[PDB]
Amino acid sequence: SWVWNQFFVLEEYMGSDPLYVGKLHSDVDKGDGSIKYILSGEGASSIFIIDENTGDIHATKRLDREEQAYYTLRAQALDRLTNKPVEPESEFVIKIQDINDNEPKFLDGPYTAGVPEMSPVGTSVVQVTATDADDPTYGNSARVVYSILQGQPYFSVEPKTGVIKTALPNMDREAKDQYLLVIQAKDMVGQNGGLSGTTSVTVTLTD
Amino acid sequence: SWVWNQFFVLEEYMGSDPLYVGKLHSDVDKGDGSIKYILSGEGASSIFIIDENTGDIHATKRLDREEQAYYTLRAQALDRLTNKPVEPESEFVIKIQDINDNEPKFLDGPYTAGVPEMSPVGTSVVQVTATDADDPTYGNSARVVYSILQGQPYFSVEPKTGVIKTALPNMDREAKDQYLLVIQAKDMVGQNGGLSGTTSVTVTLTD
Ligand SMILES: [Ca+2]
Ligand SMILES: [Ca+2]
Ligand SMILES: [Ca+2]
Ligand SMILES: [Ca+2]
Ligand SMILES: [Ca+2]
Numbered sequence A, B: 001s002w003v004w005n006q007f008f009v010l011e012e013y014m015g016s017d018p019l020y021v022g023k024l025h026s027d028v029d030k031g032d033g034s035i036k037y038i039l040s041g042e043g044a045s046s047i048f049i050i051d052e053n054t055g056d057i058h059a060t061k062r063l064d065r066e067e068q069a070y071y072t073l074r075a076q077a078l079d080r081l082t083n084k085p086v087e088p089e090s091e092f093v094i095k096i097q098d099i100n101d102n103e104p105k106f107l108d109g110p111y112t113a114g115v116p117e118m119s120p121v122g123t124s125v126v127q128v129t130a131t132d133a134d135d136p137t138y139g140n141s142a143r144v145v146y147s148i149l150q151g152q153p154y155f156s157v158e159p160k161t162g163v164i165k166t167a168l169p170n171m172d173r174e175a176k177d178q179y180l181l182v183i184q185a186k187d188m189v190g191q192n193g194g195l196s197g198t199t200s201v202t203v204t205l206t207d
């Protein structure tokens, strides 16, 4: 079945005029005001208000998707005289639409890892993980690309997975036993304008 | 029935970023990308574009409610592999929301009229009419109030109907047999921020 019972409103609005969310409407409504539209549920009468005559919903404050990403409300349509329902009460969702306002963050960083000296090229060393609190299903605001800022050509990193691998054969611990890498994670899939985060990786060569 | 299959776009958007309209979704969609969402109908694949994977719809150009107020489209959900439907098609509407961007106009102006001299106060002279291309069905963007800018105290105008009337008694043709009035029509029922238009009325005193 098609799912239609959802509205959205953009997060982090800084204007003074309340944002318009949408309109509750019964097709029984003849435009004569005899139906009263009533809002209940999450944020109802506080964050979200309704005009009982027109069904228009507004949001009354700046909203943060990363605080709560959506709200589940209920809609009623009552006859003004009798207060009896003209429609069955229905749930509906108000979705908080994402903007890219969070940087990728390496929450478990910094990293340390060991790898045997003289490992073959392509040996996995460690997987680093940047988390991006934005919406991974809308645009690229939470779609991250990994890169090595400092550490090429000795190591490589898989751009989508954050797995660091050895890149040079025949590393000698006697010559150099430790490497200090800087890894970047950048959203908007690394495109210009993306937000970024970084972490350090200390790689020790083990015998 | 509750009406949930209606999206909205505010007219006359001048930003470079395409305006987000909303999201199509079938509850057959398991989030694995096996469904393709497609649009057809008014504005499809030109004015309105869709991300086939996510169902997200954007508007690609500035729209004018006074050019077209509504777009009726069809949603389909297709199997990505076979291109065959996994839902019955469903109609939906994109409503273009009004802004007050048209001023009242006296398209049949200016006016000429006669009224007998020595008439009772409140004698009808002529009815002027301003039209306003904005949306009359809600709000005051096309609801006008009439006023006389030049021509008081000799004449008055009914603020809602535009009927111009004599205001002074014992008007004497021999003393003065022609008056030139300037009439204003202002939308937002004459409130501050309303747009305005004017016309003139040449009134002759008769027997
Ligand atoms: Ca936020
Ligand atoms: Ca982000
Ligand atoms: Ca966000
Ligand atoms: Ca317009
Ligand atoms: Ca207007």
Ligand SMILES: [Ca+2]
Binding pocket: B011, B065, B066, B098, B099, B100, B101, B102, B133, B134, B135
């Ligand atoms: Ca308009």
